[PDB]
Design an enzyme around this catalytic site. Sequence first.
Site, PDB file in Angstrom:
ATOM      1  N   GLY A   1     106.754   0.334 -59.340  1.00 19.77           N
ATOM      2  CA  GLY A   1     105.500   1.096 -59.131  1.00 19.77           C
ATOM      3  C   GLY A   1     105.467   2.233 -60.178  1.00 19.77           C
ATOM      4  O   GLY A   1     104.358   2.687 -60.474  1.00 19.77           O
TER       5      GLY A   1
ATOM      6  N   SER B   1     109.001   1.466 -68.722  1.00 20.92           N
ATOM      7  CA  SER B   1     109.029  -0.036 -68.731  1.00 20.92           C
ATOM      8  C   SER B   1     109.853  -0.570 -67.569  1.00 20.92           C
ATOM      9  O   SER B   1     109.354  -1.316 -66.668  1.00 20.92           O
ATOM     10  CB  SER B   1     109.581  -0.487 -70.069  1.00 20.92           C
ATOM     11  OG  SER B   1     109.688  -1.953 -70.047  1.00 20.92           O
TER      12      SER B   1
ATOM     13  N   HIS C   1     103.482  -5.123 -69.118  1.00 17.82           N
ATOM     14  CA  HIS C   1     103.839  -6.073 -68.015  1.00 17.82           C
ATOM     15  C   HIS C   1     102.881  -5.842 -66.849  1.00 17.82           C
ATOM     16  O   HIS C   1     102.705  -6.755 -66.003  1.00 17.82           O
ATOM     17  CB  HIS C   1     105.323  -6.030 -67.652  1.00 17.82           C
ATOM     18  CG  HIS C   1     105.813  -4.799 -66.920  1.00 17.82           C
ATOM     19  ND1 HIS C   1     106.487  -3.778 -67.513  1.00 17.82           N
ATOM     20  CD2 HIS C   1     105.825  -4.532 -65.578  1.00 17.82           C
ATOM     21  CE1 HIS C   1     106.818  -2.858 -66.631  1.00 17.82           C
ATOM     22  NE2 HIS C   1     106.442  -3.308 -65.448  1.00 17.82           N
TER      23      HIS C   1
ATOM     24  N   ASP D   1     106.034  -3.413 -74.681  1.00 19.13           N
ATOM     25  CA  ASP D   1     105.692  -3.191 -73.272  1.00 19.13           C
ATOM     26  C   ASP D   1     104.559  -2.132 -73.238  1.00 19.13           C
ATOM     27  O   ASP D   1     104.811  -1.044 -72.724  1.00 19.13           O
ATOM     28  CB  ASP D   1     106.855  -2.907 -72.322  1.00 19.13           C
ATOM     29  CG  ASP D   1     106.461  -3.170 -70.871  1.00 19.13           C
ATOM     30  OD1 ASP D   1     107.306  -3.109 -69.958  1.00 19.13           O
ATOM     31  OD2 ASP D   1     105.270  -3.453 -70.551  1.00 19.13           O
TER      32      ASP D   1
ATOM     33  N   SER E   1     106.323   1.983 -63.309  1.00 26.92           N
ATOM     34  CA  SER E   1     105.998   1.451 -64.637  1.00 26.92           C
ATOM     35  C   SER E   1     104.636   1.933 -65.188  1.00 26.92           C
ATOM     36  O   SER E   1     103.707   2.024 -64.377  1.00 26.92           O
ATOM     37  CB  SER E   1     105.894  -0.110 -64.556  1.00 26.92           C
ATOM     38  OG  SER E   1     107.266  -0.483 -64.677  1.00 26.92           O
TER      39      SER E   1
END
Lengths: 181, 4
Positions: free
Chosen positions: A135, A152, A33, A55, A137
């Site tokens: 942030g 994720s 993402h 992801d 992720s």
Amino acid sequence: IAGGEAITTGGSRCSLGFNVSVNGVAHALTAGHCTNISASWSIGTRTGTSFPNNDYGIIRHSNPAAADGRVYLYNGSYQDITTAGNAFVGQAVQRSGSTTGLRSGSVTGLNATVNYGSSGIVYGMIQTNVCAQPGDSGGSLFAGSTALGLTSGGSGNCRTGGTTFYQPVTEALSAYGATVL
Amino acid sequence: PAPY
């Protein structure tokens, strides 16, 4: 730059998951993402992305000397990474990310389906009781020197606690023929 | 849940 540190594109920020090698060429895994946003990152150029459903995403380093095969612990020290593995329910894990730093907890479920609404649905996610915030992720989910996943998303925050989901790192490594450094 |  090591696992858990910030990587940016324009005004967007995510965290590095793990530095890896693809046929000897240094790359970095992060969340899909995040890589969907742009091909141009502070550390290099995106060479793969997969979100939603999965992801994960991969970026080729502009500077191969920066591919540090460790996770930053946010206390001036680093955890050396040597292999990748699969998580198990009840495992003691740590997560590193650029918003909240290092947090610990345990795996509470596997193969979780996560509906992110307008962003889509992801399948086969590792579930934990570790908190995370925007942030974080793409950052590292690990147990000692074994890489396990990439942050994720989730619910809650690091003040109230919450639930977080991670993309299993082994699927990302095999998608790209990569090995952890 | 939301993507971080």
